[PDB]
Amino acid sequence: MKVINDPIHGHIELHPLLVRIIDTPQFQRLRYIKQLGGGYYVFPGASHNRFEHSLGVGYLAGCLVHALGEKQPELQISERDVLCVQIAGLCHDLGHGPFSHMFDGRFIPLARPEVKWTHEQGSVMMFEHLINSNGIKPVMEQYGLIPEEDICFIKEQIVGPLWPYKGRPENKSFLYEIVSNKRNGIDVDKWDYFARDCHHLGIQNNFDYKRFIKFARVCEVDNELRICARDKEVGNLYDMFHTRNSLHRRAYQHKVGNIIDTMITDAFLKADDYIEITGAGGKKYRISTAIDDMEAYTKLTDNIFLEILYSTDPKLKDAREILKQIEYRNLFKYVGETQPTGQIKIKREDYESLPKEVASAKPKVLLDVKLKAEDFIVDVINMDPIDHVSFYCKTAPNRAIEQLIRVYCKKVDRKSLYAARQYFVQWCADRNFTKPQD
Amino acid sequence: PMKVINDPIHGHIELHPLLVRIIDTPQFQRLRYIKQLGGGYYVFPGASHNRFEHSLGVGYLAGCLVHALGEKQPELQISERDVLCVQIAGLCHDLGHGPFSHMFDGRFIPLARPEVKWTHEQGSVMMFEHLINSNGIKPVMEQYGLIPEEDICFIKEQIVGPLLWPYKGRPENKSFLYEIVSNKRNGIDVDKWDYFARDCHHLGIQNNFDYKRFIKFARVCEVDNELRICARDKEVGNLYDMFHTRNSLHRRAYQHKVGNIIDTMITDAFLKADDYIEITGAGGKKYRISTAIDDMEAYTKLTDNIFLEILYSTDPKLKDAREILKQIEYRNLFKYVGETQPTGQIKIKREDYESLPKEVASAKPKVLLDVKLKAEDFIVDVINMPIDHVSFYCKTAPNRAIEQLIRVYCKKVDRKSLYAARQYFVQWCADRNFTKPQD
Amino acid sequence: MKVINDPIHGHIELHPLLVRIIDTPQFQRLRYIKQLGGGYYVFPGASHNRFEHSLGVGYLAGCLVHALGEKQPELQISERDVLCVQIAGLCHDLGHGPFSHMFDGRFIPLARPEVKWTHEQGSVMMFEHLINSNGIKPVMEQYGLIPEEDICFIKEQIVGPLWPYKGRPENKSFLYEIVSNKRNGIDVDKWDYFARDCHHLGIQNNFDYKRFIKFARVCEVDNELRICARDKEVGNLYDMFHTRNSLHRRAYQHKVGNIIDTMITDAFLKADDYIEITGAGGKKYRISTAIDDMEAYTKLTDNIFLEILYSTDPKLKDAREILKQIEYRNLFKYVGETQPTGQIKIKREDYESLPKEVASAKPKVLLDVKLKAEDFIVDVINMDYNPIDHVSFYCKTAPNRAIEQLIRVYCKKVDRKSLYAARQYFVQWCADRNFTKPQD
Amino acid sequence: PMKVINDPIHGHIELHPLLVRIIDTPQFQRLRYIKQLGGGYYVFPGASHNRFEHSLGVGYLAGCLVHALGEKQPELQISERDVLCVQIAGLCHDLGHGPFSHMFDGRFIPLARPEVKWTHEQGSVMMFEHLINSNGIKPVMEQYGLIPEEDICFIKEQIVGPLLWPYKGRPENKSFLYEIVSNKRNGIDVDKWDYFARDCHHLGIQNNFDYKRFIKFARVCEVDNELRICARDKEVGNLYDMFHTRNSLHRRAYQHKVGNIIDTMITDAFLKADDYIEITGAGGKKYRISTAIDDMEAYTKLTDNIFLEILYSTDPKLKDAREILKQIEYRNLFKYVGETQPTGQIKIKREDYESLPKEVASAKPKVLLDVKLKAEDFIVDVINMDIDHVSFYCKTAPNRAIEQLIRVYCKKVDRKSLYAARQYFVQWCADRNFTKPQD
Ligand SMILES: Nc1nc2c(ncn2[C@@H]2O[C@H](COP(=O)(O)OP(=O)(O)OP(=O)(O)O)[C@@H](O)[C@H]2O)c(=O)[nH]1
Ligand SMILES: Nc1nc2c(ncn2[C@@H]2O[C@H](COP(=O)(O)OP(=O)(O)OP(=O)(O)O)[C@@H](O)[C@H]2O)c(=O)[nH]1
Ligand SMILES: Nc1nc2c(ncn2[C@@H]2O[C@H](COP(=O)(O)OP(=O)(O)OP(=O)(O)O)[C@@H](O)[C@H]2O)c(=O)[nH]1
Ligand SMILES: Nc1nc2c(ncn2[C@@H]2O[C@H](COP(=O)(O)OP(=O)(O)OP(=O)(O)O)[C@@H](O)[C@H]2O)c(=O)[nH]1
Ligand SMILES: [Fe+3]
Ligand SMILES: [Fe+3]
Ligand SMILES: [Fe+3]
Ligand SMILES: [Fe+3]
């Protein structure tokens, strides 16, 4: 029964089971993986990692359940239910890779285009590895959990259904909207990293989750059980959503922030063949295939960045040279942005091909310089109002009331940069993407 | 052409292009990979911040203060040359920190090479000379009005002190400029300001000191015909809030019991790994962790990275060290035996840190005990550390002015062995004449 | 330089000029006038008076002005302007009478239908009395105020134009939206008693004025200069308006709260002839006429309730009997509520006549008992004002430019047959007055 | 039929109809016209609250606690009759307070009638009996199961104490019920809880004590085989913060310097007016302010109202008193001379308050001074203050348990007379052997 002090949430009381899950290598791994990935090289305050964030989500998961259980004893929320939601929140991010969203969103699609991989697949594999490597399942039983039944439940809360849910019956469906919510984008995962990311980026977060948790209730909608907010709390809700918008516009879509991310992945790609990560049975993996074995994956952290940078191996001199360019601030240069409006969206599978298409656009008038596909970086940003949440009133508590595409150039001179803007504008034309602004 | 960096504690920070030129180097970005609070992060989840953002802030506050004194008092003859120099000093005062900051020069080097006198402040000066040579900064200095010979002296001296008026970099009439970045006398400098605001911010402690206010009311005045930086009498209230902050950070965070236990565990791994880990320095030569300080090129490559190189290593030579770091991940820590302080004005010197376990373990405690422990089973932790010396002035007359702790840990966790450790220690305290350890 | 500790605003720093206005009898008057009138008899937490509310307004006025002056120097806002806005905030309630709104809203319309009286007229008369009785004008100039021009500005901030304004040029119009705002219902006066009234009533006030003040800016709107808010702060504004709505629904329109107000007024009416208030030149005034002399008005406070209650005077036995009714809790009984929807609103001038009308409605079928006009109390409750649309905004990208009546009737007769009789008359009176049909 | 009142501090308060019958009387509603902190309101604008809302809260808390003890411990034989009585007691414990609360019996009556022994708790008992007699409560008591003879005794005893086991109202096996409303020994009762919460709320002070929690873990247990109310050991953390609230209210509010000066000014006005004011009592007789305590019917009409009655007066017999209250409005207060304490454990008795200025004025203070002051120029303010003495229990074995300040003010405000006042006072402290005044 430890008490941890967190700068956003204050004191976080931790169930001994939770403590047993937290003091394992598969969880301490999150201490070495930046929350905002390449954010830190643009935002100096953003040194924070997945680890404390996982702590906060786990805490927020629990605050909400225990709250719903107290205001409404008829939901039959058990001490068993609160522990699983707490464990799920804690481990939803077990599967993040080097520099978080950079890894499953850009590196694996470029490194192994055929493979379908998400960090949510990654978390469940890592959670399974965690409870097996550390004999967690006996300790679950010691505190009243049913390992077969509850381990499924935690997994389904993280990666979704593997009525589709086997972990809990539908009269407890609302337990599935606590940690991550597909429908109205309101979950304790957002709350923590909304509060957390503003705190480190120097943005003001006026959203008050304690207030929202206090007035939160389960209510019936289309004969479905959902979590609802009372009508007074729409003012708080506009402040939640305005923060989500500021974080995206100001932080998550930052131009240099995202340019630098593609430089890092270009380094990991040129370095993928020459770095070995040690797995099970002593087998050796590459950076891109360590996702295939969880003990190697345990060992795949932000560390790999510095390992490349400090390397003396001549085989890694290319990968090294790109990371020296991040340190010297000689970055890739911005060419332009465009959108596939009205058009079919670019799929993760087709990322590898895009620079070849850009370099192949025929931009007549003819140009002084010619560029090959290796001089182009094509960066796909996927985006994934108030009205879509469901409310209630005190009188009737029973009843309910994109893709951006950016192109960077590795060549830094004005004559070549001009050329790049020309190819780029042509490629947009004959792909029927929107016309780039000047 | 100014770069503007957004910082959570100081906001928008405008950076002179010269400052930028210095920042975008490996000798500086190296600070992105060094925890401000070392092993603190393993006790306070918020303490993930590194020396890097802190170095930006000091550089900023330095400039803020100099520029402020210069505008209010033009007779001080503070130049753009002078301001730039003070700023670089803030920027580069932490260039020399080692893996996990103070754990490194404060415990590791004293335990690994007792013969050596090494400080991060010496290190900051070597790294700074190394920085400006490797990156052709001296032409860039000359371009913005710096005289490299004279001014490079000034920056080093603001960092490491005099290398009679001991300073060769600036005359005594500009003496006050040596009090901005690092103030030896009253411990009030813009560097403390940054890491008090910054360390409170990440730890969730309330900090009531308002430096913007303190800077706004700061003046140079004559005290014993020496020029010092002074505060208005009204602002003695703001000063007390700084010191209540210095005191709660020390009690609550930097002297935290598990925090300092974990430091020594980390340091025990670095010691047990020092011989089998190689860092490539200049001229291709190879250095060890403890001797990499002898070359700034190897030293550049020595960051928090080394904790994970040890943890992820498969080398069978490193298993002994690796196991201490795996202990930390599993949370089986060294055990607290007790705390004491050395009475009188005597303080244990850094050179004698290595001997301390030999002394504690050799103490003869009577009654004789069930177990006898070797010195290798003891960790001795030396933990080191108010208007007086501050100068004030009044609005009417602006020209003129008005510890060590020792904790001992046992590596053996068994109750019989733990009981033994407490006895040796209580004895050791006795005829070293340290104070009696309490229950 | 004084500092006052207040439970809603923390520390309130007061300019010595302000303290000089406060330490006078005309201002200390407000310590003895309940903010919520008959509220205290329904809400035990509601003991707060005009005195602390006025302080808060004065403080909040200054907070807003100083904010605008520091973020936007081109407005040319002086320390003189700040003092004037503060004094105006401070003295905007000098003219409230016994139990505040009961007095200018119901007693004077029943005691003297002929007269036009508002507490806003009252504030100016009393403010004029204050600065004259305490030799304030010499002290005003001591701190840089121009007595002639600035006393105008202050009166005008309270009671309106006496471009219509003589106190400040049109390039400083926005200074007229701080203390009281006719247009968008956003001012520092409502800000105070929204927080202050919730604090004492046990209601949650989520509105953060500090946050709103930090992002407030002056902008050009239709070639008009007004106070605007950043688009971000609509979330905060929604919570302000919800508070305004709860205070009105739950507190200011409380059914028993309003019954008790009409009783106190019934007692003041029956006592008006027999109570004498000493004015200037020693003349003696009545409750209804002390408003005609500001020296007598000063001594007219909530005190008068207890003077009636403690009386042994047989002339006041009638009044005394009603104040005994309130305390034994034998109150007037609720008969019903209705609205003048679609019809002309009942004017203050016509309040006196209404019970005669209600008692004259022919409620056929005939009833076992008959009621006289003296057995009816009709209470006209006015609440003059998406409201969120009438606010003006800006975004950081374009900082230069901008983006009812209730009628209740109570009966004094408390038996079931008479109450039933009463409902019939009331339901009829609504019928041939074309007011809404009363609900069950 | 249960009425429910919303309280800003305690939320919804459900009132037994019997309780409502008692509240809606003149003797009780009298408390709507008596400030809780009296003259405090003239120093703290938030402090406008009266005894009335406080009495409701005590009544609410009394029932809350009695009901909880009964639910966890059915063996205590706590009846619906017992609970009603404790509640009425909480409600009516403050029935006897006079104009401006503690100012009245603590200073006005001791100075106006030095011979008489009067406390408000005595007053509460008389007012309570007048209450049930004049308003026919005893038939209503019998209707809800109270036995008027036995229980009216019990209610009085909870208020003024015993009039060997001294209590006739309830047997010793129900002794603990006497510790709820007012607890003489360990200063922990629900009366204190209420005005600690309420006084914080209106003063803007932070109150960390959680009564709801403390109530949840309270139990009756045997202490020296005597029955006492106990707290669970784990929850002592809650107790320390109760006492910390008691400490801040006293340091920051109740012993406030100008607040207490003002109270003696009000008292000086009541004294200069005691003779010319008539309050009509029973049998038509006329009483003075100081003797209205002799008749409960007169006392009923004596509230804060007497203050404005004096101030608004045009009567010239009352012109002297009027001027002291006119001083208050213009803020020309009495001036502070100094503070002292009675060294030794001796306290100045209320009976001797009147003479205190006579002693001060006759002190021969050589050095001889330019001016001499008479006793009419001195105000002597006696300020009275009324953690381990609490009884605890453990979850495993629940059945069994584990000052005065004196201030002096001067009415003459000039520099020359004020200096004299300090000397007379310093001397008086000397030859009364009280401690040396500071500053
Ligand atoms: N267990 C654990 N605690 C952490 C961690 N990070 C921060 N903490 C906090 O740091 C403090 C020290 O951690 P512990 O290893 O549990 O030290 P301890 O509380 O003395 O543990 P015991 O040896 O069981 O007494 C705790 O109070 C936690 O609040 C972590 O990763 N694991
Ligand atoms: N130069 C530099 N900027 C940093 C660093 N860390 C954070 N930043 C911030 O991140 C922003 C990223 O911009 P830059 O890296 O300078 O790229 P840029 O804006 O194209 O710079 P220019 O090409 O000179 O215009 C900077 O303006 C800084 O505010 C750093 O280490 N070096
Ligand atoms: N002047 C004044 N102060 C008030 C009033 N209401 C509350 N206060 C506060 O209560 C205390 C009143 O004491 P003052 O006489 O005004 O100030 P003081 O320090 O006691 O006396 P001086 O400063 O010497 O005149 C102060 O702390 C004020 O903050 C008021 O109506 N007038
Ligand atoms: N009885 C009583 N209620 C009060 C008092 N102060 C506030 N209240 C609250 O104010 C409400 C209004 O008073 P009521 O007692 O209901 O008056 P009423 O409705 O005319 O009387 P009933 O119809 O018999 O209930 C009460 O229900 C209480 O919740 C008080 O002093 N006495
Ligand atoms: Fe997450
Ligand atoms: Fe530093
Ligand atoms: Fe107002
Ligand atoms: Fe009390």
Residue numbers in the entry:
A (entry chain B): 115 to 276, 285 to 506, 514 to 530, 547 to 583
B (entry chain D): 114 to 276, 284 to 505, 514 to 530, 547 to 583
C (entry chain A): 115 to 276, 285 to 507, 513 to 530, 547 to 583
D (entry chain C): 114 to 276, 284 to 506, 515 to 530, 547 to 583
Provide the authors' own sentences about this structure as they appear in the paper.
To ascertain if a differential preference for G-based nucleotides in the allosteric site exists, two further structures were determined, one with dGTP included in the crystallisation of an active site mutant SAMHD1(115–583, R164A) and the other with GTP and the nucleotide analogue inhibitor 2′,3′-didehydro-2′,3′-dideoxythymidine (d4T) included in the crystallisation of a SAMHD1(115–626) construct. SAMHD1(115–626) was crystallised in the presence of both GTP and d4T. The asymmetric unit again comprises four SAMHD1(115–626) molecules arranged as two dimers but with only a minimal contact between one pair of adjacent α13 helices. In this structure, GTP occupies AL1 and again the active site is empty. The electron density that nucleotides were built into is presented in S6 Fig. The G base in all three structures makes the same hydrogen bonds with D137, Q142 and R145 of one monomer along with a stacking interaction with R451' of the opposing monomer. The basic side chains of K116 and R451' also make equivalent electrostatic interactions with the triphosphate of the bound nucleotide illustrating that the binding mode for each of the guanine nucleotides is broadly conserved.
SAMHD1 is a restriction factor that blocks infection of certain immune cells by HIV-1. SAMHD1 is a GTP/dGTP-activated deoxynucleotide triphosphohydrolase. Human SAMHD1 is a 626 amino acid protein comprising an N-terminal nuclear localisation signal, two major structural domains; a sterile alpha motif (SAM) and an HD domain, together with CtD, a C-terminal region required for interaction with Vpx isolated from SIV that infects sooty mangabey (SIVsmm). The HD domain contains the active site of the protein and in combination with N- and C-terminal sequences also incorporates the two allosteric nucleotide-binding sites, AL1 and AL2, that regulate the enzyme through combined binding of G-based (AL1) and deoxynucleoside (AL2) triphosphates.
